Design a protein around this ligand. Structure first.
Ligand SMILES: *[C@@H]1O[C@H](CO)[C@@H](O[C@@H]2O[C@H](CO)[C@@H](O)[C@H](O)[C@H]2NC(C)=O)[C@H](O)[C@H]1NC(C)=O
Ligand SMILES: *[C@@H]1O[C@H](CO)[C@@H](O)[C@H](O)[C@H]1NC(C)=O
Ligand SMILES: *[C@@H]1O[C@H](CO)[C@@H](O)[C@H](O)[C@H]1NC(C)=O
Ligand SMILES: *[C@@H]1O[C@H](CO)[C@@H](O)[C@H](O)[C@H]1NC(C)=O
Ligand SMILES: *[C@@H]1O[C@H](CO)[C@@H](O)[C@H](O)[C@H]1NC(C)=O
Ligand SMILES: *[C@@H]1O[C@H](CO)[C@@H](O)[C@H](O)[C@H]1NC(C)=O
Ligand SMILES: COc1cc(/C=C/C(=O)O)ccc1O
Ligand SMILES: [Ca+2]
Length: 504
């Protein structure tokens, strides 16, 4: 029996520097309690919809570091191994991804990145813990996970896959760049690569806005006013007035247009200083010496960005990065961030956390495929940074898109926010929360499986716009384009007909 194989499995595990905490049979329909999950992760449970054997481990990665590692080995197994990854500066195992991919038949692992919780404080004075976050946590879970898969199933595994977004997107690219043989297929969303500069750019928003109530700051109401004017200026460039900017690279908005006139209600317009703030927010971050560090925030992400990036407080992840790693001073004042700090951080680049190597020929040579996607109203990580990486790879590898298409495809997703949510057709199946069925035509993960196992490369990636979230009726779908193409509404038929659009 499958249960009996699982209850007998702890005795079969004997791996150096791996301590088995427990092995449990978890039937489908179980609502797992996760009492030990770090409180800052904000998840104490996970529904597991299909039978798995659950293995939980503590794996020492050095004499002063360890990861927590979970492996969920499904009863209904397809012969495919998969690793998940992390979010933010967190060690949070993404149990929602473990449920998702195990439920699709993958032998699945996820590790906590080498520490517990969403704070960067565990990096403080602990280079081995930081090294786990940069590269060694994900890789260790792949090595151990593959071992466990082969121990548990007579058939072993035929192919190996990666699924992650945000920090998880970065970790997918760290795999491509440093461990070209870890995965046959890598699915990496909205990647936090160019990571050091991402922290600097996150930190620089405070220097532009200033604190809540200052001259230079905009309230959430004013960011809503600003959003509506951005749509007036840009929504229709793609040919459809649908509240979505299909490719914001064509949107260069001019916000002096909504500077207050005499006799205008001050709550519906900007002062000159506020307009200057907005112009700078849609400008790139350049460093000492006048070199580019991070591209502009793409227009369209204003409502959620007002709460997270433009809220008049220093962004927390970057403050943590500068206090605990760059300067090792927990009292470092993040309100006084300057580009001189960004130079110090970029030169430090610990364990090449930048994850910005543009020569990925070793991955190509090993036979790997990578599919990356990025939402074009992303409020946390600008979609333009993925576009910059693409240019850099083409330039460095000295090949055009037709050649890159053989092993590296990048889809730009209209109306998607950071990793999930947004105003438009974000339902591409990168996570349970974006799921529109399991079939490759509707699901990015299964599309990678098809590319790897049948040699069928995805031309576009379909997403759903839901009436009221995943599981509700699909209102419309759209076939998102493969960069450098963009989507343009041509008709015939209304913009809700996916056939009325063309990638151009
Ligand atoms: C980090 O969090 C994990 C839980 O996600 C902790 O692992 C648990 O620790 C206790 C105490 O050793 C074990 O008895 C449990 O079986 C563990 N749970 C799992 C899922 O493995 C881990 O201890 C924490 N790491 C620390 C504090 O270093
Ligand atoms: C699982 O349990 C938690 C409480 O621990 C609850 O919030 C969640 O809705 C449950 N899920 C289902 C679908 O029963
Ligand atoms: C701990 O590990 C470090 C880093 O790998 C190593 O150089 C050092 O010798 C070790 N110290 C002990 C106490 O084992
Ligand atoms: C701004 O607009 C969004 C819809 O895009 C709305 O849900 C939100 O409540 C508005 N925010 C404020 C502060 O009015
Ligand atoms: C300006 O707008 C607010 C709504 O934001 C309204 O309550 C207030 O009465 C208006 N003031 C004037 C002078 O029109
Ligand atoms: C196209 O569909 C949208 C979505 O409901 C709607 O706003 C619009 O009226 C439709 N256009 C026509 C011509 O029916
Ligand atoms: C990190 O080093 C590099 C940066 C670039 C950047 C090009 C650009 O930023 O416009 C190009 C090649 C490099 O080796
Ligand atoms: Ca539009």
């Amino acid at each position: 029996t499958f249960q009996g194989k699982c209850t007998g499995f702890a005795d079969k595990i004997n791996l150096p520097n791996v301590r088995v905490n427990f092995v449990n049979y978890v039937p489908g329909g179980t609502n797992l309690s996760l009492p030990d999950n770090p409180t800052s992760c904000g998840t104490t449970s996970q529904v597991v919809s299909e039978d798995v054997c659950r293995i939980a481990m503590a794996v020492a990665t050095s004499n002063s570091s360890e990861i927590t590692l979970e492996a969920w080995l499904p009863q209904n197994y397809t012969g495919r191994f998969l690793s998940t990854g992390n979010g933010g500066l967190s060690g949070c195992i993404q149990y929602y991804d473990l449920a998702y991919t195990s439920g699709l038949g993958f032998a699945t692992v996820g590790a906590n990145s080498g520490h517990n919780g969403t704070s960067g404080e565990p990096f403080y004075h602990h280079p081995e813990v930081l090294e786990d976050f940069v590269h060694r946590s994900v890789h260790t879970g792949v090595v151990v996970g593959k071992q466990l898969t082969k121990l548990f199933y007579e058939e072993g595994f035929k192919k190996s896959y990666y699924l992650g977004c945000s920090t998880g997107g970065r970790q997918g690219f760290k795999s491509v760049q440093k461990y070209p043989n870890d995965f046959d297929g890598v699915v990496a969303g909205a990647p936090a690569f160019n990571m050091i500069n991402l922290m600097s750019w996150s930190a620089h928003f405070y220097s532009i806005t200033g604190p809540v109530g200052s001259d230079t700051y905009l309230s959430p109401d004013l960011w809503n006013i600003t959003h509506k004017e951005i749509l007036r200026q840009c929504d229709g460039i793609d040919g459809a007035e649908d509240g979505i900017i299909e490719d914001p690279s064509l949107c260069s908005p001019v916000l002096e247009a909504i500077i207050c006139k005499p006799g205008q209600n001050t709550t519906e317009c900007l002062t000159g200083k506020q307009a200057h703030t907005v112009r700078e927010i849609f400008s790139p971050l350049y460093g000492v010496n006048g070199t580019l560090l991070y591209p502009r925030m793409q227009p369209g992400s204003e409502v959620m960005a007002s709460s997270i990036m433009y809220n008049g407080q220093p962004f927390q992840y970057s403050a943590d990065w500068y206090r605990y790693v760059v300067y090792e001073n927990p009292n470092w004042d993040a309100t006084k961030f300057s580009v001189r700090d960004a130079a110090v951080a970029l030169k430090q680049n610990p364990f090449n956390l930048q994850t910005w190597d543009a020569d990925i020929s070793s991955f190509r040579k090993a036979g790997g495929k990578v599919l990356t996607y990025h939402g074009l109203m992303d409020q946390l990580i600008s979609s333009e940074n993925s576009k910059l990486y693409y240019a850099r790879v083409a330039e460095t590898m000295n090949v055009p898109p037709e050649e890159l298409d053989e092993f590296y495809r990048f889809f730009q997703i209209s109306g998607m926010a950071h990793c999930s949510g947004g105003d438009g057709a974000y339902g591409i199946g990168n996570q349970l929360v974006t799921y529109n069925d399991a079939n490759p035509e509707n699901n990015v993960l299964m599309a990678m499986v098809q590319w790897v196992e049948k040699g069928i490369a995805p031309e576009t990636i379909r997403g759903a716009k839901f009436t009221n979230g995943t599981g509700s009726a699909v209102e419309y779908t759209r076939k998102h384009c493969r960069y450098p193409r963009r989507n343009v509404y041509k008709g015939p038929g209304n913009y809700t007909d996916e056939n009325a659009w063309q990638c151009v």
